[PDB]
Amino acid sequence: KKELITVFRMGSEGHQDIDLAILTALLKGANASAPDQLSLALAWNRVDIARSQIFIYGQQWPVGSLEQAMLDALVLDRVDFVKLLIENGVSMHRFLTISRLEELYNTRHGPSNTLYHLVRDVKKREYPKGNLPPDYRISLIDIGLVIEYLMGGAYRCNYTRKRFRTLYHNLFEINHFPFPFHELMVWAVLMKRQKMALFFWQHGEEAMAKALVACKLCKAMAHEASENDMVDDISQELNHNSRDFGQLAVELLDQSYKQDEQLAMKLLTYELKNWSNATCLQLAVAAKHRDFIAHTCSQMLLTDMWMGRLRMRKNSGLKVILGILLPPSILSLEFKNKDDMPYMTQA
């Protein structure tokens, strides 16, 4: 049985280290399929081993095993395994379903979280019961109720809308999410996985809206954790996560202001259909983000909102007073175009 014996030699090309020899010997001593090696490397939290041996050139892969390993890496809070699996062909659009997301929200591995207290509070508020059963499966509708409570105001999550409730009742690519990274952002923010949320922020569209939503959700969860007399370190860490997401949104606004001013205005104003028809400015104000509105792009956007459909912008105050007192002075004013920047309430 010469094939089991792995010999380490000092110097030369004997892996230059004990641990490549040990882990490679374990991988070919198991001698199983590459899903088994990938699950072993996931258990050992060794991303370099899985990259240099399991994901070598010419590795045969069973159909559906990579998505199972993706789910297993997602539930165990392994950022670099998700990065490696994404870089090796697994896509979020073909993977993330309603049932898989519900399994992700109902996982018990990884770090601790305050999601169960939130679900219990919104269930007590919705049906005044009380404590949840231990064998309770948290539906996505309850997650939608949790977001609404935390976002606040007149926010309406896409889970609680009639289309999603109709799809939930009729099933428990229609079940696939059109923007899966939004749902993964919200899931990683809710179960307090900061590194996974920062990874999911980079991938996908609507990054500024995601950052502001994550900032307000982290602030609201910190306030709820402080109100429910929980551990204060959880509240401090949630406030730190909120400040990190706010700093990310501010730096993204700086980059957009540096590249193109008008496209930064259009990024700041356009209606976010995936975020209850809101606006990035509204999300920043609702998050009480002082540094986002005090930025020059938001201030000059508010100046453009202030003047209405008027160009003017030179010796302000006196001309509008002369227009108010003398209505024949109104027609001698330079008005803006019909479609220059049409800020409307209801189209």
């Binding site: 049985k1 089991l4 014996i5 792995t6 010999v7 380490f8 030699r9 000092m10 004997g14 004990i18 020899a21 040990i22 010997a25 374990l26 070919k28 001593g29 198991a30 199983a32 899903p35 088994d36 699950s39 072993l40």
Partner: protein
Amino acid sequence: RIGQGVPVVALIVEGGPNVISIVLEYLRDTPPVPVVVCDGSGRASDIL
């Protein structure tokens, strides 16, 4: 829970006449156990 037990390795440094029988017991086992040896220590590891 994919259908595997925990993996077991056997690191051998130097050793005497008995560790060859230990390696024989490890290799001829169901399930088999891989053996990693080290070079430069001497005795049974160097003859291996």
